[PDB]
Amino acid sequence: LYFNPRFLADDPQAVADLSRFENGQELPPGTYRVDIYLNNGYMATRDVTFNTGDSEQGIVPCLTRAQLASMGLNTASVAGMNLLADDACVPLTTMVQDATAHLDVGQQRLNLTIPQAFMSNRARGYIPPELWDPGINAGLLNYNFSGNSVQNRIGGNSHYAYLNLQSGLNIGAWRLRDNTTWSYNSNKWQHINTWLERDIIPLRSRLTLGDGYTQGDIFDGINFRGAQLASDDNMLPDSQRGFAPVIHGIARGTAQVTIKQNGYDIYNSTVPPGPFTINDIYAAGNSGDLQVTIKEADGSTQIFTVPYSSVPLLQREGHTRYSITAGEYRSGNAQQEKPRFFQSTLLHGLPAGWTIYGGTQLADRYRAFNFGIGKNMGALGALSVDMTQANSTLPDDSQHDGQSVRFLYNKSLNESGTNIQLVGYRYSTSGYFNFADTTYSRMNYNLAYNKRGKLQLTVTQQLGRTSTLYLSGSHQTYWGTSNVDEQFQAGLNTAFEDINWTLSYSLTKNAWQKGRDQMLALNVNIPFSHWLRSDSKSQWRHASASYSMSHDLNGRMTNLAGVYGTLLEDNNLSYSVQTGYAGGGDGNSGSTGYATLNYRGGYGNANIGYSHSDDIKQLYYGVSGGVLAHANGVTLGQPLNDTVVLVKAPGAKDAKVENQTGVRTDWRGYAVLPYATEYRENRVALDTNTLADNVDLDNAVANVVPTRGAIVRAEFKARVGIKLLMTLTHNNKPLPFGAMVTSESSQSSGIVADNGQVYLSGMPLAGKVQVKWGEEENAHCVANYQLPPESQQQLLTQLSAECRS
């Protein structure tokens, strides 16, 4: 790494300020807590013992075989690594070709020039497990307050007060939460839930002690209280989330594999000569099949098509999801008991599109067995046939038996029209029961009515280019009686130019009552954004108007229309005024109306909702907020959504971060971010526009990996002082382009620009100015400055000085 200063500036001499960047300083240590990089990426930070070597710097690192396994380097592609021990130095610079060293202690980094041909493979978008923040030992508090103003004509004096409270606690790696309310009518506390969960990093599980619920996939949702051992899928990356078959291919030599889909290229990478696996295909069931080919160098291309299916019950080969729950049964009913049960599920993936699953429920008086096999065959879609053999117990001392079955089919097509998505045909006998029926007992026959057969149907349709037909309907049968539960829904979605047209239709039918209910309404949305003139600050803009007409085909003809928009520039105050009219059906008319004023400030949210009708009038009001009690004090802000990203900025008084409306910074200098992610990377930007004249930040890009339920800080060093512009001249000669100007009194340094100009930030009234452009041969320019006390109310001052030697 050597640059030529001849074309850098047009004379023989410009600054000996080119050595410092690439190989600037050599040093004997060693252990000074340096980071470890691998092809420009922060992996981890360890302590590497440096020894005496023969290189550009003079020192070589010393690693082992086990430390290179978690880094990413393939140990199987390197011969002679396995013959060595596990406690000696590995000569990577001599054995592995083209592997140089690069040590920079100025910013604590260590780069490794390793080519991708000798590296191993991993999914695109991998996140290291050792860069997870468990949290900061603090607490958590959240609350909400609401009220009502219901008033009528005859007997219209009533009031309501709904108060909420959320207590949280995070000490170490434990997540303790608590929820409670406070009702007040015109009157005591009421506990809802309290659990204690704990994440598992090596076994990839999620331990939960206390209140919880199971998954809805195999069995219906059961609220329980106790232990809960299950795995999470949120720790897995987005490139491996979904279904993707394993592509098996054999390449003779170095080729180029371009995975194409629907005439478009979606993947392009080089493959090593021999066997290769592809596991970076996203989940796209409704996009046809795949066209994977190999472009060999001679001109021999293997054209082959692979079908694809999309069923959420089917898993991928190499994945295993399990769930084991234990505890008592709590449903909140006053006519049920609290028995004991034991639910345990297990899912394993098999090759050639095969999946095996099954689980059991071990209670004292309940035994249910399930056994399902999923078959994927390609061009015929998929099929998942399961068998459910349960054994319940009636409370009047009578044992009975029964089996169940569920028919599930899926089918996809690419370009003939739209395809089907889900069809479910459930079938059972008369002696079939559930877990919740056995728990319902108030002893000392009650009921004999369960489900018989369930049929689901949802067919979507896309005709043309700007039209979408949606059709959906359900079906349910019961034993004995002729009650048929049907729920048909149909909608139309079309957009002509900018205006959107919507025509929906519903058809509901219950079993406890008579009469088939239906509704035929429409929706017209005309946005007033591009139809009018556009200027800088209107304050009337981002306006839109809605128009809906309802008709239940029974004489009742109602309507709905409302105009909503924005008023402020920062989009914090939201208004929504809508109205309508009634008439027909049963002889009931009236002119309803609504007026909701949503406002979102920095400290707390507040809204005013005015409601109006013929004989019922009320007002909506409520004040929310969140209190964050930390070690440095109490910082207010918006109510959290189980994600705490704390920003520590001492000196910042009005800096909005980026992307948030109304989120600002308090007088102390702290900021919170309720809208962020979990187990991934984030970007916290800082705007320096409202940090007008005393605080100058250095950087504004933060990259942290938070977790679910933790507090992550954000270090941003600020500077206190005023800035000034000077002109340093070294004995009637200008300074070269690029030098170093430091100060003993202040933290900052400087970079000398053209014609002897230097920019400094955070400098005092007086201080020693040290100039050293080249190598340390002599102390030559040592000067100072003296700002006048009159010039203080300015943004930038310009003056000159002179070196004393």
Partner: protein
């Protein structure tokens, strides 16, 4: 002696909506990140407020609707090309046109919430210059 037959019926009444203009801003993005096929922007959480429900409502099902395209995602109504909208939740479910979601209603406070998320991504890569316009209609169903 004298028998008295008492028969009643409990019906379901709709609730009252509070929020109807939750505008999610994306900000400004670069074309270098959406050049490669298979990238996305950062997530943006959003929720709804469904309070003041009378006696007779415990299961609230929300239905989604909107314009679609040939891929299966939402159709952009702006002047931009090769960019779509994706709607998900806190369980890893793809919410397409006609998707339903049924949650439970608390009795101690009589409220209901729907937490959602809207991000920005491309499929084929190489996003063009234009605006992003999308209208999502959510109809509330009571049962």
């Amino acid at each position: 002696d004298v028998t008295i037959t008492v028969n009643g019926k409990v019906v379901a009444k709709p609730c009252t909506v509070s929020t109807t203009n939750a505008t999610v801003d994306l900000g400004d993005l670069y074309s270098f990140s959406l050049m490669s096929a298979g990238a996305a922007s950062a997530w943006h959480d959003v929720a709804l407020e469904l309070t003041n429900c009378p006696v007779g409502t415990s299961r609230v099902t929300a239905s989604f609707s909107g314009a679609a395209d040939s891929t299966g995602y939402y159709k952009n109504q702006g002047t931009a090309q090769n960019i779509q909208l994706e709607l998900q939740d806190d369980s890893g479910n793809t919410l397409n046109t006609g998707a339903t979601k049924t949650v439970q209603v608390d009795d101690s406070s009589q409220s209901a919430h729907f937490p959602l998320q809207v991000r920005a991504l491309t499929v084929n890569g190489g996003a063009t210059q234009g605006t992003i316009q999308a209208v999502i209609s959510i109809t509330y169903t009571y049962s």
